[PDB]
Amino acid sequence: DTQVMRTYHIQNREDYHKYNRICGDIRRLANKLSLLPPTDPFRRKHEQLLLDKLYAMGVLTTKSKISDLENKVTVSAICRRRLPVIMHRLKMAETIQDAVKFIEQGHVRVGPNLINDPAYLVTRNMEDYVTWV
């Protein structure tokens, strides 16, 4: 539990509860949409669109099967969509700590806008445009 709270420089303790509720909604959506006859194109089409939008959200960066929806969607996946982890893994800063130290005091820029929030999220297609000021 608090392993996740300490790995990714979470400024709070509430954020693990919130992302736990969102991932719970995704799992119960997966189970309810799972229990249909598998030739019903309702199930195929809606699980397909759920796959494609979860491609775009960067959570399932891995190209996926259906059964990954039970398997990989955790809190830590969406926590790896937080800004300084994108910053570190894009090899700008040196630690996650120092990335959060830079976003606390305004040197980081996504697009044309200043950022000062350590809970802004990035897509799989907005992270091309990250620079400094």
Binding site: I26, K32, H46, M57
Partner: peptide
């Protein structure tokens, strides 16, 4: 039955699109 299941699943899908869309541009 089947139409009911399409009703509640289309409901939660419509809600879930909204909840991810809040995080989509913020």
């Amino acid at each position: 039955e089947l139409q009911k299941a399409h009703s509640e699943i289309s409901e939660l899908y419509a809600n879930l699109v909204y909840k991810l869309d809040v995080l989509s541009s913020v």
